[PDB]
Symmetry: none
Subunit: 147 residues, 6 copies
């Protein structure tokens, strides 16, 4: 009477990014076979050995059929890099990134490392930042920048 | 029934200044036609070809009607500048901007760069800002300002 | 149909106090005429030219009738000043203002710049202010002040 | 059958010594008028503008008559004092008062200036306080005190 | 339906800790007598006289019966002490106590002064404590401790 | 409205491996009896004596019933350690661990002391960490790391 769902949680041992359709392939290949938590399976892909560990099966044992839901667990970080030669000083705020170069130029980026504001000021003396609001101070004038 | 908000965002490829009433002209002409994100439309103004790109439509597709909100995008952030020659020191607070000039005068603006208070004190020694309350301190007396 | 009220806001360019019945007299003279924001009117009072500017007409334009509400604005913020000669140190707290004078005397005021407590201590060494409580420390004695 | 008395409590904002019969004069002037809590009245005394505030009226609104009792209060805040000779250092916490004497003795009082804990430590080196928990550090012993 | 519960609030003038059964003894002695707020009663315990003041009776006058609830109002502190000789430095955290001894040993206790972890590191250079996580840093080894 | 719970923490004095259902057996024997912190119970198993000490009863005294949760204590805290030679500086955050080594290498671990990001920068000048966002500053470029 009570309906019980079937789900298998898998995790990859080597650090590699899988294609969008990887899940679809694993469904097609595994169906018909029975698996239990703790098993380790070796698959040859693109002439390279990749090991997959079964994290947990609900229920255990589990039989793989088209209806079974399969989920992959992964936790990689996104690394972004911008080449900057001759950095002078760096000011970091929880939700804003401000970098000053030796050339008396100020660049303002967001969390996504995208360029929003660019200005050069000969008489740049001080730069102040608070949350998402930024202000540039130069002997000639006051610049107020609002995001 | 339930009312759902519709919005269309347009941006011009060339950098040109549009009249304030531009929105009024556009909506009246375009109503009745359907547009989808990515479309390109050409409009002739005073014998000049300007290309407008449809940045986004919510929902997509979108039907252009007088009741829909149409907005023009020009810059990612808002930039305001004020010429101030001979700045001595600048104090920045989340909701207050205080600038002190060599002439021993104190100017207090808000985030919108509008003038709220103006005073000059020969014996100006210290200026302090805390929360929505601001105070100016001079050897002869104390000025307390409530906003 | 929702009803919209009628209100006119006026501001005087010169800083002068108007008689108590001034407002009522102006109302009588104006009613019957239509006014719009930005208009400037000149009135001769006791051989002195006082210029009044129309700050805002709600709605614009506005018709002046007996039923219309009239408000005169003097200042946008509240400025209070107190004479204090020979200030040595000043401590600001979210809801308290404490001033220490070279004469070894401590004055405690509230946000409204009113005097609550006055005490002088020959051997005054430290003044501690936190949130809403005040404590004065001198080598001879300890004073506990509860707001 | 029920007895109901009429009383008004007034407080003067400026700190000035009033003559013994001052209350008598005020009563004579005020009777016949009705007053409500919070009202502020300005009176000229000896060529000085004194502001009197109505602290409370029992009952409110109160009608001043010959039989109405008026009391003069002059306590804007609660002030307590303790005599202490040779204080070494004072540490103030949100809800605790800790005083260290030159004789390497530690006394802990509450907001009410009452004695809760008392100890002496020859090798007293440091005192640490955070929240409602306090600890005393001496070269020989670690003392932990829970409020 | 309206059942009225009776309560008597007592407070002692001298500060002393009472045994758990103290309340029971008082009740036995009092029943049968009538008491009103403000009365003073003297009880001899352990050869020392203690004076108890009746803080308030609800309702008054109250007749003491077995069914009356008696409550004692006091604000005493709990003192726990551990012998520790040769303390080097002490760091206090909101819910953790970390002590470093001259012998380069690190002790981690909780608020109750109970020992959770004991370790010793010859090359102890720094100790960091924040939130429910603590870490010990020595030039040879890095230790991560989850509490 | 109010939920009540009972828990007993027990610890064995001799080091012996107990079966998974050992807890169940103890429960059956003890129920019906009252226990208090500090009591010692002796159980005969296979002719060998094993003593169990009652570490703490919550609340105390406690009556053991089928609904009471019984827990066995073995590891009060989780300690994990890694060998690291030549540590230069260490910065700890509530949910992030950043370590900098003398060899100009930067290691970023999570709470579980697992490698998430590992890189080396000859010209490493400054390292700044805030919340789950990490930034590395080197003369060559700016590195932004998003968790």
């Amino acid at each position: 009477e009570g309906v019980i769902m079937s789900e298998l949680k898998l995790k990859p041992l080597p650090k590699v990014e899988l294609p969008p359709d990887f899940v679809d392939v694993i469904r097609i290949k595994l169906q018909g076979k029975t698996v239990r938590t703790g098993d380790v399976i070796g698959i040859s892909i693109l002439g390279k050995e990749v090991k997959f560990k079964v994290v947990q099966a609900y229920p255990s044992p589990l039989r793989v059929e088209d209806r079974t839901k399969i989920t992959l667990v992964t936790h990689p970080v996104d690394v972004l890099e911008a080449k900057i030669k001759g950095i002078k000083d760096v000011i970091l705020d929880e939700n804003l990134i401000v970098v000053i170069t030796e050339e008396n130029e100020v660049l303002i980026f967001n969390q996504n490392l995208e360029e929003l504001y660019r200005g050069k000021f000969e008489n740049l003396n001080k730069v102040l930042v608070r949350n998402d609001l930024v202000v540039i101070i130069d002997e000639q004038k006051l610049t107020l920048i609002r995001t």
